[PDB]
Amino acid sequence: MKMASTRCKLARYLEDLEDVDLKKFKMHLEDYPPQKGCIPLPRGQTEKADHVDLATLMIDFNGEEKAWAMAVWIFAAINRRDLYEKAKRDEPKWG
Amino acid sequence: MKMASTRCKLARYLEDLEDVDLKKFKMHLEDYPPQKGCIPLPRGQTEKADHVDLATLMIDFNGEEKAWAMAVWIFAAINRRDLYEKAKRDEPKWG
Amino acid sequence: MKMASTRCKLARYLEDLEDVDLKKFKMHLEDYPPQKGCIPLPRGQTEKADHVDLATLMIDFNGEEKAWAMAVWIFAAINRRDLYEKAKRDEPKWG
Amino acid sequence: MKMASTRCKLARYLEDLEDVDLKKFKMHLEDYPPQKGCIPLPRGQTEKADHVDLATLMIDFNGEEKAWAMAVWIFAAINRRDLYEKAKRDEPKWG
Amino acid sequence: MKMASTRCKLARYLEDLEDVDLKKFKMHLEDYPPQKGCIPLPRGQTEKADHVDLATLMIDFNGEEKAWAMAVWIFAAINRRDLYEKAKRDEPKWG
Amino acid sequence: MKMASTRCKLARYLEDLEDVDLKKFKMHLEDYPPQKGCIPLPRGQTEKADHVDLATLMIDFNGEEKAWAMAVWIFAAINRRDLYEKAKRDEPKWG
Amino acid sequence: MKMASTRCKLARYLEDLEDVDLKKFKMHLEDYPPQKGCIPLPRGQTEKADHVDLATLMIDFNGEEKAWAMAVWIFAAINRRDLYEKAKRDEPKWG
Amino acid sequence: MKMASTRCKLARYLEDLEDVDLKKFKMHLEDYPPQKGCIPLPRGQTEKADHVDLATLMIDFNGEEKAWAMAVWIFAAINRRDLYEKAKRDEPKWG
Amino acid sequence: MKMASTRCKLARYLEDLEDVDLKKFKMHLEDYPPQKGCIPLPRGQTEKADHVDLATLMIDFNGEEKAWAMAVWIFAAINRRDLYEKAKRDEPKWG
Amino acid sequence: MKMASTRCKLARYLEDLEDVDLKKFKMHLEDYPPQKGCIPLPRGQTEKADHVDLATLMIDFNGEEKAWAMAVWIFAAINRRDLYEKAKRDEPKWG
Amino acid sequence: MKMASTRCKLARYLEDLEDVDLKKFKMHLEDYPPQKGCIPLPRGQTEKADHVDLATLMIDFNGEEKAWAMAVWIFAAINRRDLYEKAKRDEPKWG
Amino acid sequence: MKMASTRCKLARYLEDLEDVDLKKFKMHLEDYPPQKGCIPLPRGQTEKADHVDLATLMIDFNGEEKAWAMAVWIFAAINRRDLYEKAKRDEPKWG
Amino acid sequence: MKMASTRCKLARYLEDLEDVDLKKFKMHLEDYPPQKGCIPLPRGQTEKADHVDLATLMIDFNGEEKAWAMAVWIFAAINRRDLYEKAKRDEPKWG
Amino acid sequence: MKMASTRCKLARYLEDLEDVDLKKFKMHLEDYPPQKGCIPLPRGQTEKADHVDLATLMIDFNGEEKAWAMAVWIFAAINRRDLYEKAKRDEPKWG
Amino acid sequence: MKMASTRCKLARYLEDLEDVDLKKFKMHLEDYPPQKGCIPLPRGQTEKADHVDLATLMIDFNGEEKAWAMAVWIFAAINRRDLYEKAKRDEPKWG
Amino acid sequence: MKMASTRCKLARYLEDLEDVDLKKFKMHLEDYPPQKGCIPLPRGQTEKADHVDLATLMIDFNGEEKAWAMAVWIFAAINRRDLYEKAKRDEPKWG
Amino acid sequence: MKMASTRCKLARYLEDLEDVDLKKFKMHLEDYPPQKGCIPLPRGQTEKADHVDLATLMIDFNGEEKAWAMAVWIFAAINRRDLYEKAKRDEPKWG
Amino acid sequence: MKMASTRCKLARYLEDLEDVDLKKFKMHLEDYPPQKGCIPLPRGQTEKADHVDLATLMIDFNGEEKAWAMAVWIFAAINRRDLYEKAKRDEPKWG
Amino acid sequence: MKMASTRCKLARYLEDLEDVDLKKFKMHLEDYPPQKGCIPLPRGQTEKADHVDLATLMIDFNGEEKAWAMAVWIFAAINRRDLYEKAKRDEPKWG
Amino acid sequence: MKMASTRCKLARYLEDLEDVDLKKFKMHLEDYPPQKGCIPLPRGQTEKADHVDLATLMIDFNGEEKAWAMAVWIFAAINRRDLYEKAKRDEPKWG
Amino acid sequence: MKMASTRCKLARYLEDLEDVDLKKFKMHLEDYPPQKGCIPLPRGQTEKADHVDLATLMIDFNGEEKAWAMAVWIFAAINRRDLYEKAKRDEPKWG
């Protein structure tokens, strides 16, 4: 309820995405730009993960900060501006 | 058959919807007004649910009371009056 | 062939149902009325059972008498009147 | 049958969950907030636990009181409102 | 190759069955009619037995004669008419 | 090519059917007359089978002779005469 | 065959249970209600016992009378109504 | 090699049994019915005997006649019908 | 790359086929004519094999020569003349 | 046989115990409660005695009546209810 | 978002295509000319792939350079000029 | 039976533990914290002791008081909360 | 060899016994029932004799007739039925 | 490497088999035809042998000649044509 | 992390593959051409190996050099051009 | 609980790993880089060690300092960033 | 070393046997057929003799000729065909 | 530690092997080729030796030179190429 | 019985010890520290004495006071804390 | 207790070892390097000595200095790093 | 130490042997081949002597030269190749 772990909010945001938008999100995840210090996700596990395991994989691979940054950037890139704005407005208080 | 659970009545009322009317219903579900204490449905789950899984999701997300309230309000919003007064007249006896 | 167990006839009747009719059947199973002394089936197993495992679960949970009664009532409720008539006419001889 | 141990009722409620709902439940279990006096379950054992092993693991890790509290809170968190209110109404008489 | 033990031919015929057809076959096995001098198989072992273990279980429980008779009868019962006629035509020479 | 099994010829004849003609064929299949010693097909399985799965189901349920007889009769019934005499002249040599 | 020891009948009925049903049965043994004068089985031994060791453990721990009573009650509690009825009908003549 | 002592053939037949089948055989040995003039084997020694010591112990307790009768009856009781028939057909000439 | 095992080329050719063409291919495989010395494939495994396992099953059941001959004949039979021509031109050099 | 000394029957009853049950019996023997006027057995002798030397040592330490009473009490204590009932039913006629 | 991988912008260019234009694109892909050192795509996979799977299959089969070259040529072939010069001006900086 | 020696109750509690839980219990035994006046057990004997030898080893090495205290602490540490609460509630009256 | 004194035959028969069987034989030997006119052997002498000195002691204490009677009786009592039958059939010709 | 003992090559060929193919091989081993002068393997040992113990068991039971002949015949019978031809081509030079 | 053993990089590259791509990789592994000095992997173990066991099996069977060469060649063969070029660019420094 | 031995915390962190993550951890342990003065664990014991035996093996082989360093580095290498951060944050106070 | 006494070669051959094979060999020694003029070994000595004392006892009882004949026959009988052939081929030159 | 006896290094290399790899190693040990001057190990002793007793037995039977040569050859033969290379590179200086 | 010489009590306490515990008691006996004024026992005499002659030797060497002091000291040293407490509480009344 | 002879602490350290670790310790004792002026232990006595007799033999052969040095070196060699560090930290004050 | 009589060296070499190896050494001792001019040792004396009295008996029977020759030959024959090499290299300087 409201406050939770970062994985929970990330899973909710990924659950908001549709099916084709999820496919585009996975495509962007597998080819994240080498710069900005991030590890692209392998195609092996980003094939069956629907919305929960995808968030687990992102967090596990990149850490909470980097996973949130990539989620925001991809939301901007896959032309889901509403989700991008919501994620920018609801950034968890890191500490 | 007449006396049943709230979910069955909601599913029947969703059967009474048209196709584009169902699409408008899904639009209003995913983007319900923030007030009146509601949890808007994710777009990922309200994409393949036609008439049964949609009712199950509404009930599961919002409780029987407020799901019925949302159904009545959205029926009013889609300019489908007949369903609106039918839902008002056939409200289950709460308690 | 004809003379067989109750589960066989119940599985045949459930196989007669379509896909959306099966979904409505499962929805009615998960919310069977508390009265008439019956145990509603949990949603966990009524999600993969297509037509055989559904009959197994119904019989296992309710006993043969109650399972047949629930099947007949639900067939009446999901507006499959032909199946309801056939089930009423072909009630197994209990003893 | 009605009166039983806490693990039995908890296993029933966990069995009521679906597949993706079960994944969300496990995800919330492994990252339960540090406060409210609860110990998050390690990710290692919450992978094969479907509904029996998961319930016994929660009870074993947290005691009956905390296991029931976490079950109610997570049912609220994964938007399983019907299970949430059902668990609240049938809250065991502690002692 | 052609001439072999009864278990081999029975395993071949069971392997010919599909997935849902195999489920129907097992379901008929566990509720085989009490008459006609046969012992129904317990539900415990007929869950992991795919086609070889199921055949050896039938043979072990009922003898070659009764296993073949039940196989033919169930092939007739689950509406596998091609398998039924094939088993009738290639009935082993007992002795 | 030319000489093949009965199922292949039946599948080709089903390919020769139209869309609404296929729907009428399925209607006649699910509601075959009780006489003439034939088993009507369940409605659940004849809902996604277009032309190959439908032919497999017909053969499997009825045997080659009965399946060919019902195919000819239904081809006559749906006012597709040309297919009717085409199936009459090209009947496989039984035996 | 027919007449045998009590452990044989108990082992047969336990063998009838499935895998998840066996896990539920083991749960109900380990947390049997304190009343009715029964000794719950320790979790240490009810971990590898499949169906024969479990039955002999029940008998050895509780006596034949109490083991049969517990088996019937748990069969009722794990929603195995058919096994519950069968155990009620085939109760050994105590004396 | 074919012609040998009774213990040799009995050991061969017990070696034909599987693992859980061996457990069932031992269970039936320990609780042999008091009638038919036989001495049930103690549970202490029928725990590590796989098939050699088990056959030796059965012969030692019962004599040739009683051990063979017990073996045949238990093979019938544990649903090893093929082994039961083989033991019946290959009973050595007593005298 | 170009030169490879026979199974690789066969899997490539089967991968060329569409979905409904794959269903027709499987149907023709299950009913290969008894003449020409070939073994029809069972339906149990020829239900989930998409394009690789199907080639493995064909080669495994028939040998390389017979599998290639069957593939060519079925390609001719399912009216994929382009694949038939390509297979005729690209026949591996047996030796 | 049957009519024999107390040591013989006690040795038979101890032989009825398994290995871990024998270890539990020895543990209870070494720490028999100080009340009820009994002499605990030293751990030196109850280390290699399997079932005969243990019975002889119990008799030599306590007398026949006391040894039988302790054996019955321990059989109750190590959860050997069947052996406890058997020992209670066939208590030797003292005096 | 602007600076990204080749696959993402290729997928966007595939997005810009129409429905029948996409079908013609797939038709040209499956039957690409043998020259220009490119590998034609199989019919099996390019009949579910709409716009993301099609682009990733193109890249996977041909490499970035060849995929871009074939995309430009096919865009020219479908008389969709605007995409053709758009692909020329927005060619990624190779190296 | 209820009133017994301390080693008996400790052996019962260790018997309640599972296999991997027993491994963690042994691991905590071998590396008990040096403070609060306790002697860690050597790894040589705490390898084959299942639950009786382990309990008598703890008692023998540490005395009754320290053995019970360490049992409680380790039950808390290996997340056996139910056993830990039972350990407080059934603590022997010291003196 | 064959024809000899009864002492040699008794020594051979005792030599046939195992180690634990020898211990049971001695245990029954010191507690031979007071009736049937025989003298039990003191535990001091029958402690280290393996099989020859035991036979000599039995002969010296009881005479040939009584020694053979005890031999067969304890052979029956320690459940050495095969040795009991062999001794019964091969009783020396007294006189 | 290349040249080795017969059991090594037999173990290699058995290791080539899959899991279900291994089960079929074991089933054919246990019920080898009585003719051709071969000894079928008991089901007791062909239950845990994966691929090396199975080969050593075949050799031990039937000699190298008959083990190779049976391996070839069963490879033919379980429809492993590739392994069958490979075993025919690489038969050891008997002498 | 960058510098590691060869098995680690090989496992990463195999993990990059999809499901059907993994099946094609295993198919090419089991039928690697006899030339180029490589030993094809047996079909038995390449069924449960997902991506780590497959990599360690390749390395163990062929050595680091040969395993890398086969991985590159198969990546080229199954039309994984991106993985092929990545493996070529990141070829380990042998020595 | 909180304060414990190093092996306990290491076992907890290994318990946090999943199944495939555990396999990757074992793979990295068996091929740890030769530098940094570490002894790679032999593959013999890292085959059945699940999470406690693996931790005690690592500690035993490398000492507490080097075992913690290896655990942190491998957690980083198998892409468990959350566990890597937690391991850095909760490093024991060495001295 | 090659040339030696008969006892040495017999001891080597017995050492070649496994544990359960040794138990079967002891069984066959203890009940060697009365025909062929051989003396069976007492069960007392054939209990602790592993492979050397057993050979010495066989020689002492039967002489070299009879002991070698018994060894060959039993090696045939316990299904040690390879050992049977080796013993038959390397029979020492008697006389 | 590094510099040690030959048995120590051989035991380390054998300990590196897995379970089934150890079974294959033992199989190759028992059937070493008769030529190149080596004595195959008996099957009786190579059954319980895991890696210590196995290395001791190999050295004892063959001497340092022959044992190391056999170990290297078997490592090559059981497809442990990495172990083969390590053993070849780390051959100790003989003399 | 209770009141006796101190030698009898010491013999009883030594008899309470196990076998390995007795060996450790002896080991500590030969190396009693030179301080605290006692004479260590030579290894020759304290090699075969079990528990009585050992106590006699301790008494003869050290006197009653020193013998009891050493008894309690080595009882504490070999981790027999229960015997240590028993000896401390039941020290004989000197004088 | 703490302050004691060298043999006592050495025996405790040997007791800390497991079974297979003890076998490795015996291996290293039997083949201690000829340098460093130490006498290897014959294999005759280091076969039954578990942990006490082994320490006594070590001391008797080598003296306290060499025994402690060998224990430390072997603890390092058998990969018991924790025991090695403990032995170094608690080296007794020689002189 | 080092330089001593040959009897001491022979006793040391015999002491190096294990238990079963010593038994094999004796067995070869009673049946030394009649050639090579040696007298075999009668079984009466060489039955209880372990290693010293056995060596003295060998010396007294055969003289130093023949005793050393027999020791070397038997060490070769009982497959103690390491002791065989050591004895060959360290033959005492006769004269």
From Swiss-Prot, chains A, B, C, D, E, F, G, H, I, J, K, L, M, N, O, P, Q, R, S, T, U:
Residues 1-93 form the Pyrin domain. Changing R43E: Impaired ability to homooligomerize into ordered polymers. It is found in: Cytoplasm, Cytosol; Inflammasome; Cytoplasm, Cytoskeleton, Microtubule organizing center; Golgi apparatus membrane. Changing A77V: Induces the formation of short but ordered homopolymers. It is linked to Familial cold autoinflammatory syndrome 1: A rare autosomal dominant systemic inflammatory disease characterized by recurrent episodes of maculopapular rash associated with arthralgias, myalgias, fever and chills, swelling of the extremities, and conjunctivitis after generalized exposure to cold. Rarely, some patients may also develop late-onset renal amyloidosis. Belongs to the NLRP family. Sensor component of NLRP3 inflammasomes; inflammasomes are supramolecular complexes that assemble in the cytosol in response to pathogens and other damage-associated signals and play critical roles in innate immunity and inflammation. The core of NLRP3 inflammasomes consists of a signal sensor component (NLRP3), an adapter (PYCARD/ASC), which recruits an effector pro-inflammatory caspase (CASP1 and, possibly, CASP4 and CASP5). Homodecamer; inactive NLRP3 forms homodecameric double-ring cages that hide pyrin domains within NACHT-LRR rings to avoid premature activation. This is NACHT, LRR and PYD domains-containing protein 3. The lineage of its organism: Eukaryota, Metazoa, Chordata, Craniata, Vertebrata. The gene is NLRP3. The chain holds residues 1 to 95 of 1036 of the full protein.
